[PDB]
């Protein structure tokens, strides 16, 4: 309850950041992926094209605002919140199908195509994009270039392709691969025609599934670019660290292949801005703690608060910031030490003053 004259450390001063600006990309780009949706010709369902995408920035907004797709189905994730969510790999399964068979392509349905060509599992989180392009993949006289499977011995595992051309056996008598009795070919040609209606034209159906495993994000959606702020205690995340500090204008340039910068003490204190190739320094804001100057018990009641290594009645001393004690140019013998050759005392009403000590 009684405090004597001297410096007492009570707590620490923390400069909490007020803004959090994050900027990974600078612009938007995409790898050649639309070529499989705009190719000269497609593949059948017995042997469909399989595409893998790796290490490529890609947005799905362009693949939606075409205003030309007749149908669109994506389960597992909301269509408007899939870009910011990040996965590992995207599998593209492109094939052709008729107008009466787009109904059967859904998780949990039976039929003759969804069970014999491509089985959809219950935990199917992909998107199905289908549209009509009958003016290119069909021609007069009968377009029979596309194939599909009609017969199979038993069920097939999902995400499995079958290209077996063996003749399916219905009974117990072998046929030795002839067009005889009690056997039939499993592969049958399509019936595409440019003068068809709305339920038997060749539609292009693609499947965009996602991979979820113990791997970092490789191909997903980029981020937006916020405003650049400098000389303020602002938290940032420039591709390797969530650091809070001021961003001053540096005078040292980097080699044109580096992104980070460390020091002798091995602390990341320099990062190149991806927006304009600007080299910015990093310096922490919270420095030191606080101290209280007390004249003593039965002498005074007011106190002076000293900041240790913080840059700002108020006097900017060489040992931080001192508030609550006026500065006087004369010098006496000092009693309460502060540091850097300047002390504080209680003299003439009477108030706490700070002065350079006399030797």
């Amino acid at each position, epitope marked *: 309850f009684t405090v004597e004259k001297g410096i007492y450390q009570t707590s620490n001063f923390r400069v909490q950041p007020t803004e959090s600006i994050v900027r990974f990309p600078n612009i938007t780009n995409l790898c050649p992926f639309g070529e499989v949706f705009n190719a000269t010709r497609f593949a059948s369902v017995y042997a469909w094209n399989r595409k893998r995408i790796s290490n490529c920035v890609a947005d799905y907004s362009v693949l939606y605002n075409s*205003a030309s797709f*007749s*149908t*669109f189905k994506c*389960y597992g994730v*909301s*269509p408007t919140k899939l870009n910011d969510l990040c996965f590992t790999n995207v599998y593209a399964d492109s094939f052709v199908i008729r107008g009466d068979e*787009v*109904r059967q392509i859904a998780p949990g349905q039976t039929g003759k195509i969804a069970d014999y060509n491509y089985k959809l599992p219950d935990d199917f989180t992909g998107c199905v994009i289908a549209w009509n392009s009958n003016n290119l993949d069909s021609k007069v006289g009968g377009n029979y270039n596309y194939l599909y499977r009609l017969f199979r011995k038993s069920n097939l595992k999902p995400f499995e392709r079958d290209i077996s051309t063996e003749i399916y056996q219905a009974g117990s008598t072998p046929c030795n691969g002839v067009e005889g009795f009690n056997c039939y070919f499993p592969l049958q040609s399509y019936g595409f025609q440019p003068t068809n209606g*709305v339920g038997y034209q060749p539609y292009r159906v693609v499947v965009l599934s996602f991979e979820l495993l113990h791997a970092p994000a490789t191909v997903c959606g980029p981020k937006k670019s916020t405003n650049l702020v400098k000389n303020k205690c602002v938290n940032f995340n420039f591709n390797g660290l969530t650091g809070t500090g001021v961003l001053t204008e540096s005078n040292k340039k980097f080699l044109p292949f580096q992104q980070f910068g460390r020091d002798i003490a091995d602390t990341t204190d320099a990062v190149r801005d991806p927006q304009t190739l600007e080299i910015l320094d990093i310096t922490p804001c919270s420095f030191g703690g606080v101290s209280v100057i007390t004249p003593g018990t039965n002498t005074s009641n007011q106190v002076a608060v000293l900041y240790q290594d913080v840059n700002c009645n108020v006097f900017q001393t060489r040992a931080g910031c001192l508030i609550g004690a006026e500065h006087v140019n004369n010098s006496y013998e000092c009693d309460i030490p502060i540091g850097a050759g300047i002390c504080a005392s209680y003299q003439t009403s009477q108030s706490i003053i700070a002065y350079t000590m006399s030797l």
Partner: antibody, heavy 120, light 110 residues
Framework: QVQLQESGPGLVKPSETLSLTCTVSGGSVSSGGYFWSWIRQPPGKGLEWIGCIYYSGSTNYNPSLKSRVTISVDTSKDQFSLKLSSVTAADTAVYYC????????????WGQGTLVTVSS | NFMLTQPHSVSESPGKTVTISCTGSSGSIASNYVQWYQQRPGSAPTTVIYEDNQRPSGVPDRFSGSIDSSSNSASLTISGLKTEDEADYYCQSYDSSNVVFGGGTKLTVL
């Protein structure tokens, strides 16, 4: 959040031009990559889709309402307006300016419906 | 020429389960997303379901939707009818760059 408020007169004469503008507060027209659409509803009848617009010049109109819907977007005033031609007595419907997040999906935010009456 | 067919008048006593249908004529009902809107009289319509099975934040769990794609009919199941449920129900579609709404259903109390 964001809100959608309509303006324009509540009356229009037959065989005239309708001018209804819906203004936006708490958001930006161009930012975010969302759509705008106008939807009307006659009293005692179901909702009828008129047309949809983007912040660019992309427009799509109903086939029954084609060649009569003119909708424009002015980003400077942060609003979009719809112009209708050859309005008849059967055009009496409550006009709703609804924000549309997904082009094939829900109209998440609906503005309050202004009453439009056509009389001679 | 794709139009959604809805029951014009549907009535059910409170506390029971009722099913509201939405049948497509030409296009299949699993082709495009179906949105159900519950509109109070003299009020703006509000979205009560989206993606044909997902309930938006704010609506009760009872607004459950199911898709019967074989019959080309979209179904919306209501369980535990209450007083505030008396409103107009409309089902939405997209077809091909032309949004098409439903006929309308008038949830009734008795």
């Amino acid at each position: 959040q964001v809100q959608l408020q309509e303006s324009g007169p509540g009356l229009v004469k037959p065989s005239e031009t309708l001018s209804l503008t819906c203004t936006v507060s708490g958001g930006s027209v161009s930012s975010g990559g969302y759509f705008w659409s106008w939807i009307r509803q006659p009293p005692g009848k179901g909702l009828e889709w008129i047309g949809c617009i983007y912040y660019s010049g992309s427009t799509n109109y109903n086939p029954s309402l084609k060649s009569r819907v003119t909708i424009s977007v002015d980003t400077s005033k942060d609003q979009f307006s719809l112009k209708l031609s050859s309005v008849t007595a059967a055009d009496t419907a409550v006009y709703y300016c609804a924000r549309q997040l997904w082009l094939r999906g829900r109209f998440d935010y609906w503005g309050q419906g202004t009453l439009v009456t056509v009389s001679s | 020429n794709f139009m959604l067919t809805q029951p014009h008048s549907v009535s059910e006593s409170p506390g029971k389960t009722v099913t509201i249908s939405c049948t497509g004529s030409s296009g299949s009902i699993a082709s495009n997303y179906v949105q159900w809107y519950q509109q109070r009289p003299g009020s703006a319509p509000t979205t009560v379901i989206y993606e044909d099975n997902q309930r938006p934040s704010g609506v009760p769990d009872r607004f459950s939707g199911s898709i019967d794609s074989s019959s080309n009919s979209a179904s919306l199941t209501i369980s535990g009818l209450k007083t505030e449920d008396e409103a107009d129900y409309y089902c939405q579609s997209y077809d091909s760059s032309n949004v098409v709404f439903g006929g309308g259903t008038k949830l009734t109390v008795l």
